[model samples]
Target chain A: DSVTLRLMTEHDLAMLYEWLNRSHIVEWWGGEEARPTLADVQEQYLPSVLAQESVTPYIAMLNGEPIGYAQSYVALGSGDGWWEEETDPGVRGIDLSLANASQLGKGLGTKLVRALVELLFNDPEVTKIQTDPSPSNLRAIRCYEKAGFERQGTVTTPDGPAVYMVQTRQAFE
Target chain B: DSVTLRLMTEHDLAMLYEWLNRSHIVEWWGGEEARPTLADVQEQYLPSVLAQESVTPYIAMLNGEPIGYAQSYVALGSGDGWWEEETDPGVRGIDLSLANASQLGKGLGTKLVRALVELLFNDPEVTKIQTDPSPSNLRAIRCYEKAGFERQGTVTTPDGPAVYMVQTRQAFE
Candidate 1:
């Protein structure tokens, strides 16, 4: 089945908030600090996602069913603090999650990531893609690696220490 | 300046060899593979500096002289496949290298990693600390993180996929 990616709109605010707050999703991947509420999603998350020049947030639909969400952005100059100043300008960082528990583990997450990677690589300015996961999260780490992401090392964030992994387009292709 | 740990010795070979070849250390921290030869050290590098129970091979030093080396190891029970069927009960996976370069980052290399965290933690029966570094000399990614060892993802080895990074008890503590 084909999975379509649609730009997240204001209409997605409620669903986005619901997905983010779900216990299943939150247990695996949540921000370092506070969880976003419905208001937070509508006001903070939606605006932030929409305002970014480099970031593009998308809702994934498989067979007309909204199964997951994905986000991608340029690393250093993307106006997002997701990366440091010295990061390569040509590289982008991607982060995504499957809010619907039933839709997970069926290769949807990898498919979403593959799609984002292809989209990012289309820009001549983008050369590498990276992700950060807790070293303890073996399943997620394996999934990324299987999709050709190489572990770069670890990065310390406000939440805790995270294992930084990356995949260069050259290596991926 | 006083360093936390001392050196490795001939007596340490039993443990040192096991540490160098431990699956956990070999899988993620050791570069390429866990294969290091005495001839590789003696011919390609420097002579051994015999200390107490340990021997300083290559760069490690005590006072003004070279006395030890640095290696990487992984966290116990992290499950990167670093142990054997009947390995030591509590051995940590560690990667080590010597501190013999002329300036060598002003002793930071040695001082930064001068203790055995497993021993300090009183976790004996630990067989070896895992160290896996990429075959390419990617030090920034390998050294920046505070974790004694960081996984650099996997590279193809004659045996299979070999992840790379470094670990030392001193760095972890």
Candidate 2:
């Protein structure tokens, strides 16, 4: 089936929350012990991410069905806030998750990342793109590498050991 | 000790031949079944590679001592007749091996590759670099990734299944 990405809207919040709360999807980003509800995603997380001027959240549609969510922002204006001070001026950062357990291994993640990164590059201001995945997430890291991200190193996030990675515009071409 | 790379000379051929024939190094590149000889390397390979104007064959020196050999050439040069005709003209290709068993895992391979790629990019004429390695050679692949080569895909060769990888000048920066 064909896949496409569309700008997020209020209508997506419910489905986005459903995907965010899934055990399989949340386990990778949210702690194994944490079980956030749809209200938590909409009230606690989505509001902040959506309000940020630099952040752009999108829904992934597979054959016209919402299958996942993706978000990207200018490095510094994103949630981490660390990127603004440390990275190049126009650098952007992104994160994504597959909401559907059945679609996990079908190369959806790679496709979503490639499309988002291409979008990032289209911006005249962006020179570098970065992401941080937990080092233990070998599957995600492999997917990132397959999508052309290089392991720059690791940085400690309050959550855990974050594997710091970047894919420069130069690398993309 | 710091490492440096110098143009290869006939004076280094004897040592290079010894390293090429070393059981461990040869086994890594080929196997016990396809052992290479000093005569074969010196007579068949050296002259042909050296004859290419774009090819740079160097001996890597760690603390002023020769430890490994490397060669880089423009991927599309007429002299590089072995390369696929449809490959990128701006990309350079590289191959190297450590003759001394002691040098394995000591970061020497990474340093050597970094140095060669740096030299290639120093020439404004070069735009990208490419390398192919046996798919099963995880160690070499890891070193290449660390040195900034992106795994493009796999291609079958007379040698066997090889992972085609490349790094562009922009990626290096």
Candidate 3:
């Protein structure tokens, strides 16, 4: 019922790499690519913890148990302008997966997601929060709905199609 | 993803009887009593349909399939001494259950709950809505939370030990 979010560090990379390789996580996330190596975790993670203008990574702990990874970032800073030119400063996006296979589908993701959005709402400048789950990922879409996110149609990105969802501060509060 | 609700009727009693006989429904509603006869269904529900003082029932259909049942009532007129004292005329109460066991694990319950809440809010006279699920009914409680219901502490009712939850028009609609 309780969730703790801590800034991820080098110490967590090992755990991240381990969890990334989990077949469940890789199934939806891996797609055409293989395991996200330790270096890959760093590349995706550094910008946020490193105080870059883009995204920040956090480890989601449910009752102090680290369940998975979550990220909140400025769409523009998340690189490649993959969000259909939503390079605006206030548009935020997130991506997450429960690292523990045992925790999958247990409703933990929804709690972690709501927590992340609550944290982002603390910054008044954030006009909107969004997430792009693979179009086929019904589980992820449902988790986002429970956390107050609304389906805003699909976005066909360079990578593939994603179910784009968004939430606003007023809606969150 | 579409949900629609229509008035409950005598003709639907066979299906309702089938669902009521289900172990899950009987556990919460029938106790250890004999199976409910079709006439028993009419005796209990006909008055509600005929604008009988208070409660009115509806059939919840998801994608045109009758998946569950829901009821909403004028709190003050529904009964006496059922809830924490507040004979507010505009207040309402709702109770629902998914008839088929196959639908239990999915999140359809939450969608139906929200759709019902939205329907209640459309009636300008309804200001507040409430539901009191047994304290141990975690599944129902979680579904209510996603529909914007707030845990307003607990109330001792003649019905049993319940985890009292409420939602206002603005919060739900």
Q: Where does model 3 exceed 4 Å of error?
A: A1-173, B23-30, B47-50, B98-107
Give the poorly placed runs of model 1, Cα more than 4 Å off: A21-37, A47-54, A77-82, A98-107, B1-173
lDDT for model 3: 0.67
What lDDT tens digits, residue by residue, belong to model 1 across residues A1-173?
77666656456668877766763333355544577778877765452323213355667778877877776654543322345433355567777754342344465756666777776677665678988788899988887887889887888755578889888879877
Model 1 is docked with a DockQ of: 0.01
lDDT of 2 by residue, B84-156 (tens): 4434545677876442423544657677678878877875656798888889899989989999999988986
**TM-score of each model, paired residue for residue:** 0.43, 0.43, 0.45
Predicted structure with the largest lDDT when compared to the true one: 3
* Lowest summed lDDT window (length 10), candidate 3 chain B: B45-54
Q: Please give, for residues A26-71, the per-residue lDDT of candidate 3 as tens digits.
A: 3465564656788876665542223322345567887887878766
What tens-digit string does per-residue lDDT give for candidate 1 at B12-65? 344344333432235455576637565443322221111100112322445645
Top candidate on TM-score is: 3
Residue A20 CA displacement from its true place in model 3, Å: 71
**Candidate 2: segments with Cα more than 4 A from true spot:** A24-38, A45-49, A77-81, A98-107, B1-173
State how far residue B9 of model 3 sits from its true place (Å): 2.1
lDDT of 3 by residue, B1-173 (tens): 88877656555666776666653344555465666777876556552222322455677887897877667765542334565375454577887744332353454667787888887777665789998888888988998998799998778887767898999877765
Worst 10 residues of 1 chain A by lDDT: A45-54
Candidate 2's DockQ is: 0.01
Q: Quantify all predictions' global Cα lDDT against the true fold.
A: 0.51, 0.65, 0.67
